[PDB]
Amino acid sequence: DDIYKAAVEQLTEEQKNEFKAAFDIFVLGAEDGCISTKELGKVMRMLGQNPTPEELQEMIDEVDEDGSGTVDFDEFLVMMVRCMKDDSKGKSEEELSDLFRMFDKNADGYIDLDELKMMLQATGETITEDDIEELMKDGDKNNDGRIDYDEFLEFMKGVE
Amino acid sequence: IESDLERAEERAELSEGKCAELEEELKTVTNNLKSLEAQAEKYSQKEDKYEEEIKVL
Amino acid sequence: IESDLERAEERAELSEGKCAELEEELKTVTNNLKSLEAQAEKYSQKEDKYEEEIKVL
Amino acid sequence: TTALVCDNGSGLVKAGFAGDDAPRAVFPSIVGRPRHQGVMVGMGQKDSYVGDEAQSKRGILTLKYPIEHGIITNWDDMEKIWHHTFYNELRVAPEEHPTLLTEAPLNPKANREKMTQIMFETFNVPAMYVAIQAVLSLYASGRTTGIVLDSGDGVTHNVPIYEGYALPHAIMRLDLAGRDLTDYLMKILTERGYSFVTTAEREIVRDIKEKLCYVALDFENEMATAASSSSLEKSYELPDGQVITIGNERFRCPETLFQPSFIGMESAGIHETTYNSIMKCDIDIRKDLYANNVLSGGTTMYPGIADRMQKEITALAPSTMKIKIIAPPERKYSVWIGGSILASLSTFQQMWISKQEYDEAGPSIVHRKCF
Amino acid sequence: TTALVCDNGSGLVKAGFAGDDAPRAVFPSIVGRPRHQGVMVGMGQKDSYVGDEAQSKRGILTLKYPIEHGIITNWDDMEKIWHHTFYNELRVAPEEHPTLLTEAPLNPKANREKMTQIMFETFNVPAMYVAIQAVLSLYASGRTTGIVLDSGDGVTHNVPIYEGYALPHAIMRLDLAGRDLTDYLMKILTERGYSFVTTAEREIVRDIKEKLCYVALDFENEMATAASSSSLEKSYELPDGQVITIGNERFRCPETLFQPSFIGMESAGIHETTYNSIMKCDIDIRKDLYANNVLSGGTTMYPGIADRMQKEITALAPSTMKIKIIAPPERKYSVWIGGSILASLSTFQQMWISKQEYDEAGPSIVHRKCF
Amino acid sequence: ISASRKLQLKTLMLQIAKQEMEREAEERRGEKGRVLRTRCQPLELDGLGFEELQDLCRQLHARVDKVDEERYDVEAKVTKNITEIADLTQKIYDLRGKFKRPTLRRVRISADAMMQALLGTRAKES
Amino acid sequence: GKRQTEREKKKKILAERRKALAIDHLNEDQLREKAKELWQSIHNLEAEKFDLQEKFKQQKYEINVLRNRINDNQ
Numbered sequence A: 001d002d003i004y005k006a007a008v009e010q011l012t013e014e015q016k017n018e019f020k021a022a023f024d025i026f027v028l029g030a031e032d033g034c035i036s037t038k039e040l041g042k043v044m045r046m047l048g049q050n051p052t053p054e055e056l057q058e059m060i061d062e063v064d065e066d067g068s069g070t071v072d073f074d075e076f077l078v079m080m081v082r083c084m085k086d087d088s089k090g091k092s093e094e095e096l097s098d099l100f101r102m103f104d105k106n107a108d109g110y111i112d113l114d115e116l117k118m119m120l121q122a123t124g125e126t127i128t129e130d131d132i133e134e135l136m137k138d139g140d141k142n143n144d145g146r147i148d149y150d151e152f153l154e155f156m157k158g159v160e
Numbered sequence B, C: 001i002e003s004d005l006e007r008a009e010e011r012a013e014l015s016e017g018k019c020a021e022l023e024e025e026l027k028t029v030t031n032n033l034k035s036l037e038a039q040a041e042k043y044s045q046k047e048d049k050y051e052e053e054i055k056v057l
Numbered sequence D, E: 001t002t003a004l005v006c007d008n009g010s011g012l013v014k015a016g017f018a019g020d021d022a023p024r025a026v027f028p029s030i031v032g033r034p035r036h037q038g039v040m041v042g043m044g045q046k047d048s049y050v051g052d053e054a055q056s057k058r059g060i061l062t063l064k065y066p067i068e069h070g071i072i073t074n075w076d077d078m079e080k081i082w083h084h085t086f087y088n089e090l091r092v093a094p095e096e097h098p099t100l101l102t103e104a105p106l107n108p109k110a111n112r113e114k115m116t117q118i119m120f121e122t123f124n125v126p127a128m129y130v131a132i133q134a135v136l137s138l139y140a141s142g143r144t145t146g147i148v149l150d151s152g153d154g155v156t157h158n159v160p161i162y163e164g165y166a167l168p169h170a171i172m173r174l175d176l177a178g179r180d181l182t183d184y185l186m187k188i189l190t191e192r193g194y195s196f197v198t199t200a201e202r203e204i205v206r207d208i209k210e211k212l213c214y215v216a217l218d219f220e221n222e223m224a225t226a227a228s229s230s231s232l233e234k235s236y237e238l239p240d241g242q243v244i245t246i247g248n249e250r251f252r253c254p255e256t257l258f259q260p261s262f263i264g265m266e267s268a269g270i271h272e273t274t275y276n277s278i279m280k281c282d283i284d285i286r287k288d289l290y291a292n293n294v295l296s297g298g299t300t301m302y303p304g305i306a307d308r309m310q311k312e313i314t315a316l317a318p319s320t321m322k323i324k325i326i327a328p329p330e331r332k333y334s335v336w337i338g339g340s341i342l343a344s345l346s347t348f349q350q351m352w353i354s355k356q357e358y359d360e361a362g363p364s365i366v367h368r369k370c371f
Numbered sequence F: 001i002s003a004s005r006k007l008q009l010k011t012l013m014l015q016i017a018k019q020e021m022e023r024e025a026e027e028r029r030g031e032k033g034r035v036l037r038t039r040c041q042p043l044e045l046d047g048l049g050f051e052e053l054q055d056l057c058r059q060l061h062a063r064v065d066k067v068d069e070e071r072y073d074v075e076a077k078v079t080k081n082i083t084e085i086a087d088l089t090q091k092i093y094d095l096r097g098k099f100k101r102p103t104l105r106r107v108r109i110s111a112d113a114m115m116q117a118l119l120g121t122r123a124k125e126s
Numbered sequence G: 001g002k003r004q005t006e007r008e009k010k011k012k013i014l015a016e017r018r019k020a021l022a023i024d025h026l027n028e029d030q031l032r033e034k035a036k037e038l039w040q041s042i043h044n045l046e047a048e049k050f051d052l053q054e055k056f057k058q059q060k061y062e063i064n065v066l067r068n069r070i071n072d073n074q
C-alpha cells in the first residue's frame, strides 16, 4: 500500500494503463469517465458479489478532500491502498514512545514547540513551514501549543 | 449542532458553579461585616462608660 | 437541537453576567470588612488604656 | 529538601508542602468498593475508588471511612488513602521527603505506633514526626497562650496552653463531632418525610448540614419563632430534583453541640467543657485563658457559633473577666497552616525521628523523647 | 477464526459474522407444515418450509412461531430454525465457529440450559456464550450508562445500567410487545368489516401495522380529530385487491403500549415502567439515567414515539432534570450491532464457554461464572 | 511538500530519532561500564597469606550481602514502576480505545485479493 | 498475616540475600580462589544494581510521560 500509493502517484505506463483498461472494461453500463458513487456501486455489483456499500462510500468520499461522491486521482490511490494496511502508521507504539521520550528531553510528557522545531531542523529533510504549521495544528487538538504523544501519533499516521 | 449544544451546556454549567461559589463567599463576608458593626457599636458605648468611670473615680 | 443549543448559550451568557456582578460585590464587601477590622483594633487599644487607668485610680 | 505536612484528620485529608498558605490537595477520606455486579466488559472498572473519585461514583459504591473517632479502625484502607495522597494528589515519592502527621490527644498508643511503623516500612520516608492537633492550631493564630477548642469531624478536644507550657491534666476530650451531627440531622429529617438511609445519602445529608444549618443565639426563642412564623424555612434541591424544605431542623442539628443530651450523650456541651477545662488550670493563668479562647476545626464554622459560645461562657464565668473568642476566617485549615509553620521552623529541624533512630529502638520510639 | 453472532429474537432471526455493520441474513422465524392434501405427484413437496420460504407459500401453510414470549415452547422447531440459519442462510458449518446467542432478562433457566445443550451436542460448536439482549443494545449506542427500553416483538424489558454496573434489582420485564399489538389491531379491524382469522392473514395484519400505524402525540386530541375530519384515513391494498381504509385504528393500535388496559393487561405503560425502573435506582445516578434513556428493538420504530415517550416522562419526572431519548435510526438491528461489537473485542475473547468446560460441569455451566 | 513528501519527512525524523536513541544507548552502556569500573575495582590476589585472603573474603561477602539488599530495593522499585506504567498504559487505552470498534467487513476483500477472486489472477501488483 | 508476610519478606531479604561463606577450610590458594569468586559475585551484583537503577529511571520517565498524557486528555 505504502509502496503502491507512492508508485501510482507518479506512475510509469504499466499500472496506470491497467487502471485505464479496468475503466474500459467497466464501460458495460457505467461510462461516467470520472467514477461517481452510482457508477462505483454498479461496477461493484457487476463484479459478481454484493458487498456492503459502506466501504465503497468511505473509499469514495471519506478520504477525499471533496467527498462529492466522485473519484479523484490521489483519492483513488488511497482507495486502492486502503483495502490492505501496509503503511505502518508511522512506526510502532514502542518506537514512537521511545522517539518521543528522547524527544521529550525536558521529561514533561509533552513536546514544546521549541524542541519540536529544533528536532525538525535535526531531521534534515525537505523544509515546509506550511507543513510545520499543519503538523502543529494536528497537535492543536486542545490547542495547548505543546504536542503530547496522542497528537504526535495523530500526525504520524501513515508515515512511511 | 449536537457537539455545539454539548459545548454550550458545559459552559453554562461552569458559569453557574462559579456563580454559586461567589454567592456563598458574599454571604459569609456580609455576615462578618454585620457582626463587626454590632461589636463596634457596643465598643463605642463601652468607651463612653469607661470615660465616665474614669471621671467619677 | 438547534433551538436547544441557542437557549443554552443564552443561559450561559446570563450566568456570566451574574458572576461578574457577584465579583464586584465580593470585592467591595471585602474592603469594607478590612476597614471595620482596623476600626475594631483601635477600639481594643482604647479599651486597654482605659482599663489600665481604671486600675490605677 | 521540603517537608510534607500531611494531616490525616477524619473526614477530609489535608496535605501540602511545608511553607505555603493552604493545603495543596483536600479530598474526603473514603474508600468505597463497588457493590453491584457489573456487566460491561473492558470498562476498566477498579476494585476500590478512594478520595475524591468516590464522591462522583458514589451512586454505586459503599463508602466507608477508615477513621472512626480519631483512632484508625481499618489499617489497610488507611494505607491505601496514604498511598493515594502521596502518589496521585501530590505526585512526590515519599523516599525524599520528611512527613509531619497529626494526631488527636489521648489516643491509643497502638494507633500512633502502627502509624509510624507504616510510614517507615511501607512508604520508607526519611523521617516523620507526630504532633498534637491543637498545638498546631495555636501556632496558626500566632499566639503563645490560650485554650483551643478543636472541634473536628471525628472528635472534639480542648487543650489549654500557657506560655508554651501545655497543661496535660486539663485536656478534656469529647467524642461528639461533625459525624454525630450528621447522623442526628439525618435522624430528625425523618420527621418531615425525607428518609436517607444509604451510606451514599449520608453525603447528601452532610451537604444539607453544611449549607443550611446554623447555631441559634438563644434556643427557646428560636424554637418559638420557627413554630409560629415561616421566615426560617429554607429549601434545598436534591441531586435529582424534588426540593425539600427544612424548618426548625436548621438550628436543632448543631444545637447538639451545646446539649449532648439530644443524641443521648451524658456529658456537657462544648460551652461547659471549656469552662471546666479552664477551672482545672491554676488560679493565676485563668484570666489569660479567658481572654484568648481559640476556635478551630471544621465543625466550628457554623454561622453564629462565636456569639453563642461567648454568651454561654460569659454566663458561666465571673463577671469581671473579659471573654474573647478568636474565630479566624481560615478556621478549617488552621491546623494545617500551623503544621506548615511548625515544619518551616529552624529550631524544630532536629526534632524529627530519624530513620536510624527507629532502627535502633523500634516503633516504640515515638513515646520517647522524640514525642 | 470469526465468531457467529446469532440473535434468536422472536419474530425475526438476525445473524451474521462478527465485525460487520448489519446482519447478513434476516428472515422471519416461522415453521409451517402444509395443511391441505396435495395431488400433484413428484412436485418435490417438502414437509416443513422454514424461514423466508414459508412467507411466500403461506397461502397453503399453517405458520407457527416457535418462540412465544422470549421463552422457547417448541424445541424441535427451534432446532430446525437454527439448522436452517447455519447451513442455508450463512452456509458455514458450525464446527468451526463460536456462537453468541442472546436471551431476554428474567427468562426460565431451563430454556437457557437447553439452548446451550443443543448448541454443544447437535451443532457441536467450539464455544458459545449467552448475553442479555439489553447490554448489547447499550453497546451499540457507544454509551456506558443509560437505561435501555428494548421493546422487541416477544417481550419488552427495561434494563438500567450505570458505569457498566448493571442493577439487577431494577429490571422491569413486561410481556406486551409487537405480537400483542398485531393481535389487537386484528381485533379492532373487525369494527369496519374486515375479518382476518387465518394464521396466514396475521402476516397481512402485521404488514398493515408496520406500514400505516403511528403513535399519537396526544391521544384525546387525535381521537377527536379523526372523528370529525377525514384527513387521517389512509388506504392499503390487500394481496388480492379490495383496498381497505384505516381510520382511527391507525394510532389506536400502538397506543396499547402506553395504556395496556386496552388488551386487558393490568400493568402500566412503557412510559411509566421506565420511570418506575429509574426510581428503584439509587438517588445519585438518576440524573444520568434521565439524560441517557435509550430506545431499541423493532417495536420502537413507530413514527412519533420518541416524542410521546419524552413528553410522558417529562410529565412524570421532576421539572429540573433534563429528559433525553436516544433513538438511533438503526434501531431494529441495534442489538445485533452491539453483539458484533462485543464479539469483536479482545478483552472478551476469554469469556466463551469452552467445550471442555461444558464436558466437565454439564449444561448447568451457563449459570456459573461464565454467565 | 506533498502528503507523501511530508510522510517521508516524518520518516526521516523518526530515523534521526532512532539514531539518537542508538547513540544514547551506546553512551549509556559505556558510561555505566566505566562507572561500575570505578565502583567494581579489581583487587590484588597474590602475595597475601591466609589471613589476608580470609579477611578479603569476609569483606567481599559483606559487600555481596549489602549490594544484594540494595539490588532487592532497586528491583522492588523497578517492579513498582512496571506496575504503575502498566496501569497508566491501560488507562490510556481505556480513554482512547474500546469504543474504537471499526467497520469489520468480510466482503470488502483486499483490492488485489478481491480482484483476483472476481477475475482469477488479474491482480498481481498489489 | 499480611503484616507478618511483609515482615518475613524483609527478613528473608536480610538473610537469604546473604549467601553461604566458606573460606577458612579453603587453603591459602583455595582462599585466593574463593576471594576471586566473591570478587566476581560482588562486581556482577553491582552491575545488576546499576542496571536496575537505570531501568527504574527509564520506567519512571515513561510513567511521567504517560501521566502527563493522561492530564492532557483530561
Ligand SMILES: Nc1ncnc2c1ncn2[C@@H]1O[C@H](COP(=O)(O)OP(=O)(O)O)[C@@H](O)[C@H]1O
Binding pocket: D008, D009, D010, D011, D012, D013, D151, D152, D153, D154, D178, D179, D182, D206, D209, D210, D211, D297, D298, D299, D301, D302, D332
Ligand atoms: N462550612 C461548614 N459549615 C458547617 N460545617 C462544616 C463546614 N465545613 C465542614 N463542616 C463539617 O466539618 C467536617 C470537616 O471537619 P475537618 O476540620 O475537615 O475534620 P478533620 O479535623 O478530620 O480535618 C465536615 O464533616 C463537616 O461536617
Ligand SMILES: Nc1ncnc2c1ncn2[C@@H]1O[C@H](COP(=O)(O)OP(=O)(O)O)[C@@H](O)[C@H]1O
Binding pocket: E008, E009, E010, E011, E012, E013, E151, E152, E153, E154, E178, E179, E182, E206, E209, E210, E211, E297, E298, E299, E301, E302, E332
Ligand atoms: N418499521 C416498523 N414499524 C412498526 N413496527 C415494526 C417495524 N418493523 C418491525 N416492527 C415490529 O417489530 C417486530 C420485529 O421486532 P424485532 O426487533 O425483530 O424482535 P426481536 O427482538 O425478536 O428481533 C415485528 O413483529 C413488527 O411487529
Ligand SMILES: [Ca+2]
Binding pocket: A060, A061, A064, A066, A067, A068, A069, A070, A071, A072
Ligand atoms: Ca469526491
Ligand SMILES: [Ca+2]
Binding pocket: A103, A104, A105, A106, A107, A108, A109, A110, A111, A112, A115
Ligand atoms: Ca518536552
Ligand SMILES: [Mg+2]
Binding pocket: D009, D010, D133, D150, D152, D153, D297, D298, D335
Ligand atoms: Mg482536625
Ligand SMILES: [Mg+2]
Binding pocket: E009, E010, E133, E150, E152, E153, E297, E298, E335
Ligand atoms: Mg430483540
